[PDB]
Amino acid sequence: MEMEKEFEQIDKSGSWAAIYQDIRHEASDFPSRVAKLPKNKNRNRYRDVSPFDHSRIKLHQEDNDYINASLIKMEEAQRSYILTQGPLPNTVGHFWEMVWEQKSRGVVMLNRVMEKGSLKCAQYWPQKEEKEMIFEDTNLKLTLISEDIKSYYTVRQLELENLTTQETREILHFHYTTWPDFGVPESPASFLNFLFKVRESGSLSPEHGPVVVHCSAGIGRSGTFCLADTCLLLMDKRKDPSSVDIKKVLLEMRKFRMGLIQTADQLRFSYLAVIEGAKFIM
């Protein structure tokens, strides 16, 4: 079926939970043996969210190459994304090592450091120009260059230096700051505006490594971002845009990381975002 009328049909019939459970039943199951090794326990935030072995990002290190991160490679859309958990106190150096090694231009953050009165990720970037951060375990330096605070999101320019080679690179930090503590946003307008700002920066384009996108677990809000982006790109590329099937795209993405889209409300929100976005594109 088309999307917008399938949407009204699920709303009128109140069957979002049944649609979402079908997706959960049909989703891929692949091994995640490296994630579950005892030496990696303090490298995982949640025991039930792990990268599959076949798609995990490897750190270029011989001691321990493990990070909780996955490469989502969308062949028809010609887009790739790295989805990862919010960094932990003992993985902030690994996180920036990955950004460096994968040649990423942008980092997309969809959570606040504290939500619901608890810490959802480490404070992993510097807040003042004159107070830079040094990650001694991976030999990197990170400096805040500029910050632009808007009503729904903040963009930061960061300088990442590989202290071993003295090479430097500019990294863009795109921080969506207004996702509610509970539920999903009422309108997708600010989320779509944010997606378009990431696109306009070059951070999603083939002349760079894959964008790094995270929330707390790296599957819910993060899944919504890449699902909406890929569906909109396919609608622009194909002769028949009504042939794009959001459930099929989501199942394809779940071949590369488990659990993408965590609730039926997130699924409904993803439909809403793609529907509204397809009208603005033209």
Q: How far is the CB of 197 from ligand JFM (least distance, A)?
A: 17
113 binds ligand JFM (CB under 6 A): no
8 Å CB contact between 213 and 84: yes
221 is in an annotated binding site: yes
114 binds ligand JFM (CB under 6 A): no
Is residue 121 part of the annotated active site? The answer reads: no
81 binds ligand JFM (CB under 6 A): no
145 binds ligand JFM (CB under 6 A): yes
236 is in an annotated binding site: no
Question: Closest CB to ligand JFM among 64 and 187?
Answer: 64
**Choices 6-14, 75-83, 116-124, 206-214 (CB under 6 A): range interacting with ligand JFM:** 116-124
Question: Closest CB to ligand JFM among 91 and 230?
Answer: 91
- The token pair at 281 is 């594109």
Q: How far is the CB of 168 from ligand JFM (least distance, A)?
A: 6
**Choices 41-49, 127-135, 179-187, 233-241 (CB under 6 A): range interacting with ligand JFM:** 127-135
Query: Of 17, 18, 113, 134, which lies in the binding site for ligand JFM, with binding defined by CB under 6 A?
Result: 134
Residue 135: which of 84, 59, 44 has the closest Cα?
Answer: 59
Burial letters 207-221, b for 16+ CB under 10 A, else e: eebbbbbbbbbbbbb
Adjacency order of strands within the sheet including 79-84: 56-58, 66-74, 79-84, 211-214, 106-109, 167-176, 153-162, 140-149, 133-135
The whole-angstrom separation of Cα 265 and Cα 276 is 17
35 is in an annotated binding site: no
9 is in an annotated binding site: no
**Choices 58-66, 122-130, 200-208, 221-229 (CB under 6 A): range interacting with ligand JFM:** 122-130
Helix (H, G, I), strand (E, B) or coil at 203: coil
- The token pair at 220 is 């819910």
264 is in an annotated binding site: no
Query: Of 37, 53, 89, 281, which lies in the binding site for ligand JFM, with binding defined by CB under 6 A?
Result: 89
The whole-angstrom separation of Cα 215 and Cα 246 is 21
Within 171-260, residue ranges assigned H as helices are 189-200, 221-237, 246-253
In sequence order, what are the residues at sequence separation of 6 or more whose Cβ sits closer than 8 angstroms to the Cβ of residue 231?
A: 244, 246, 249, 274
Instruction: Cite the active site residues.
Output: 215
Residues that bind ligand JFM (CB under 6 A): 89, 92, 122-124, 133-135, 145, 157, 159, 168, 170
